[PDB]
Enzyme design. Structure first.
Site, short mmCIF file in Angstrom:
data_model
loop_
_atom_site.label_atom_id
_atom_site.label_comp_id
_atom_site.label_asym_id
_atom_site.label_seq_id
_atom_site.Cartn_x
_atom_site.Cartn_y
_atom_site.Cartn_z
N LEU A 1 0.83 -1.20 0.00
CA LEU A 1 0.00 0.00 0.00
C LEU A 1 0.87 1.25 0.00
O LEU A 1 0.43 2.35 -0.37
CB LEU A 1 -0.95 -0.01 1.21
CG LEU A 1 -2.32 -0.62 0.95
CD1 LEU A 1 -3.26 -0.55 2.17
CD2 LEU A 1 -2.96 0.07 -0.26
N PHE B 1 7.78 3.80 10.80
CA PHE B 1 8.19 2.60 11.54
C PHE B 1 8.12 1.28 10.76
O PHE B 1 8.46 0.23 11.31
CB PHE B 1 7.35 2.48 12.82
CG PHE B 1 7.34 3.72 13.68
N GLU C 1 6.63 -0.84 6.65
CA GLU C 1 5.86 -0.77 5.39
C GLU C 1 4.39 -1.13 5.60
O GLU C 1 4.08 -1.95 6.45
CB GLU C 1 6.47 -1.69 4.32
CG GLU C 1 6.61 -3.16 4.74
CD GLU C 1 7.13 -4.07 3.62
OE1 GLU C 1 7.04 -3.69 2.42
OE2 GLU C 1 7.62 -5.18 3.93
N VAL C 2 3.51 -0.51 4.82
CA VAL C 2 2.07 -0.75 4.88
C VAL C 2 1.56 -1.71 3.79
O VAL C 2 1.55 -1.39 2.61
CB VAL C 2 1.27 0.56 4.76
CG1 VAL C 2 -0.24 0.28 4.78
CG2 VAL C 2 1.65 1.51 5.86
N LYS D 1 0.41 -2.29 8.93
CA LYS D 1 1.76 -1.76 8.98
C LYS D 1 2.63 -2.79 9.69
O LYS D 1 2.23 -3.32 10.72
CB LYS D 1 1.82 -0.40 9.69
N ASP E 1 4.08 13.58 15.73
CA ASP E 1 4.65 13.52 14.38
C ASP E 1 3.64 13.90 13.30
O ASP E 1 3.81 13.55 12.15
CB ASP E 1 5.20 12.14 14.07
CG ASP E 1 6.35 11.72 14.99
OD1 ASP E 1 7.16 12.58 15.43
OD2 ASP E 1 6.44 10.50 15.28
N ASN F 1 30.54 17.96 -19.57
CA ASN F 1 30.10 19.17 -20.28
C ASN F 1 28.60 19.48 -20.19
O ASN F 1 27.93 19.77 -21.19
CB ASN F 1 30.51 19.09 -21.75
CG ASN F 1 31.93 19.58 -21.99
N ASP G 1 25.88 22.25 -18.74
CA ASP G 1 25.87 23.65 -18.36
C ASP G 1 24.85 23.87 -17.25
O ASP G 1 23.99 24.75 -17.35
CB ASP G 1 25.56 24.54 -19.57
N1 LIG Z 1 2.41 6.02 8.34
C1 LIG Z 1 1.44 5.17 8.00
N2 LIG Z 1 0.99 4.23 8.80
C2 LIG Z 1 -0.11 3.60 8.26
C3 LIG Z 1 -0.79 2.60 9.10
C4 LIG Z 1 -1.41 1.47 8.58
C5 LIG Z 1 -2.00 0.55 9.43
C6 LIG Z 1 -1.97 0.74 10.81
C7 LIG Z 1 -1.33 1.85 11.30
CL1 LIG Z 1 -1.13 2.04 13.02
C8 LIG Z 1 -0.76 2.79 10.47
C9 LIG Z 1 -0.49 4.06 7.02
C10 LIG Z 1 -1.66 3.71 6.20
C11 LIG Z 1 -2.92 3.50 6.74
C12 LIG Z 1 -3.97 3.30 5.89
C13 LIG Z 1 -3.74 3.29 4.51
N3 LIG Z 1 -4.78 3.02 3.64
C14 LIG Z 1 -4.50 2.96 2.35
C15 LIG Z 1 -3.24 3.17 1.80
C16 LIG Z 1 -2.20 3.44 2.64
C17 LIG Z 1 -2.44 3.50 4.03
N4 LIG Z 1 -1.39 3.70 4.89
S1 LIG Z 1 0.58 5.33 6.50
#
Ligand SMILES: Nc1nc(-c2cccc(Cl)c2)c(-c2ccc3ncccc3n2)s1
Length: 386
Positions: A14, A19, A21-22, A37, A129, A366, A368
């Site tokens: 996604l 912290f 990847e999603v 996540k 954050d 070369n 510019d």
């Molecule tokens: N920083 C991010 N953390 C999450 C996240 C995802 C699941 C749980 C938690 Cl605690 C956080 C994201 C997220 C959440 C929904 C989303 N729905 C569609 C596409 C991307 C998405 N991304 S972005």
């Protein structure tokens, strides 16, 4: 003893979040889709008893402007945050696609943001954050509600890696930097974002992370840009109160809702032009760094089938994520970015000014002071041991 895998099957990536990847995932039973996540056991900043309790609290909170958390899993090497899916993407990425943007549109955005905040603070959750990437829109449209992401995550996790940690200095409250802070930092962050929506320009800016931080810590800013003429004095008032240095003197989230501007609320073409430049720059420095990450990650020295040294395949696929952000940044479709535009891009990505310039003369002696996409690509590769 709950196993993540005994419940959910992965589908497509996604994106990345704080912290980890999603990953979009699907319940093996009910077919419900979720955003997971995955937090690669990143250092827990509190007890492993302080975590479950907060997670437990978070599971029960409910607000139209706050992301819904469904489940928490931990195995020996990871943490799995199972939450809801929001498909409309990030607020800013949307706004740049708008052709008109007005003071009322911004107010309608911020008022959303202040709602989730106030609710969370009643329940004593700090975000810390809060930034544009943590604001996702529920659906595809342009009047969809905003969900705040990660509200509560950081009382428990640390972060370092410039790949991530990018675009964050603009928004962090001064007091967060010195160590003593409360929920008032989330108000300060909102003000920065309010300011950017009414101007396309961060109140505190600079050539790299540290110089931005320096501006933030000193905490002084102005309305002395052209873009602020069309902007009413009611807004500038709200902004002022939210960007008030001493947190105790700073206006609370609740009171930002009762402020004249919010209760009350032309067009701001300049802000949109600027906000587009900001997003593209942000989006391209990111891509530039991802690309360099992808290039190192292959490892190909460790030598769903889809077999049907095929690393070449996954290099072309990274070339075109980079290329897409390049094209999107090159909005006059000139094909080239100037050395100046480079300085800005490599700035927010924390490559030493002297480092890329050297690399640039290695690629093409070369030029510019302009690079085409292929040259840019060549530079990044050389900046990462290639
Ligand atoms: N920083 C991010 N953390 C999450 C996240 C995802 C699941 C749980 C938690 Cl605690 C956080 C994201 C997220 C959440 C929904 C989303 N729905 C569609 C596409 C991307 C998405 N991304 S972005």
């Amino acid at each position: 003893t709950a196993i993540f895998s005994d419940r959910y099957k992965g589908q497509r990536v996604l994106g990345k979040g704080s912290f980890g990847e999603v990953i979009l995932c699907k319940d093996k039973i009910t077919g419900q889709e979720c955003a997971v996540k995955v937090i690669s056991k990143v250092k827990q900043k509190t007890d492993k008893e302080s975590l479950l309790r907060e997670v437990q609290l978070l599971k029960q909170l409910d607000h139209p402007n706050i992301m819904k958390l469904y489940e928490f899993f931990e195995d020996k090497g990871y943490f799995y945050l199972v939450g809801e899916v929001y498909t409309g993407g990030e607020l800013f990425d949307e706004i740049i696609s708008r052709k008109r943007f007005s003071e009322v549109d911004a107010a309608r955005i911020i008022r959303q943001v202040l709602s989730g905040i106030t609710y969370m603070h009643k329940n004593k959750i700090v975000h810390r954050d809060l930034k544009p990437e943590n604001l996702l829109l529920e659906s595809k449209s342009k009047d969809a509600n905003i969900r705040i992401i990660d509200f509560g995550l950081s009382t428990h996790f640390e972060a370092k890696k410039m790949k991530d940690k990018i675009g964050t200095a603009y928004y962090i409250a001064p007091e967060v930097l010195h160590g003593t802070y409360d929920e008032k930092c989330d108000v300060w962050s909102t003000g920065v974002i309010l300011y950017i929506l009414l101007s396309g320009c961060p109140p505190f800016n600079g050539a790299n992370e540290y110089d931005i931080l320096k501006k933030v810590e000193k905490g002084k800013y102005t309305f002395e840009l052209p873009q602020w003429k069309k902007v009413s004095e009611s807004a500038k008032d709200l902004i002022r109160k939210m960007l008030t240095y001493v947190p105790s003197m700073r206006i609370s989230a609740r009171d930002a809702l009762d402020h004249e501007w919010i209760q009350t609320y032309p067009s701001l073409d300049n802000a949109i032009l600027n906000i587009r430049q900001f997003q593209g720059t942000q989006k391209l420095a990111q891509a530039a760094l991802l690309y360099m990450g992808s290039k190192l990650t292959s490892e190909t020295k460790e030598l769903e089938h889809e077999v049907d040294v095929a690393m070449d395949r996954k290099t072309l696929l990274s070339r075109e994520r980079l290329e897409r952000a390049f094209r999107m940044f090159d909005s006059d479709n000139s094909g080239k970015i100037s050395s100046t535009e480079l300085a800005t891009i490599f700035g927010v990505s924390d490559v030493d000014s002297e480092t890329w310039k050297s690399v640039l003369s290695e690629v093409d002696k070369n030029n510019d002071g302009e690079v085409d996409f292929d040259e840019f690509q060549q530079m990044l590769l050389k900046l990462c041991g290639n």
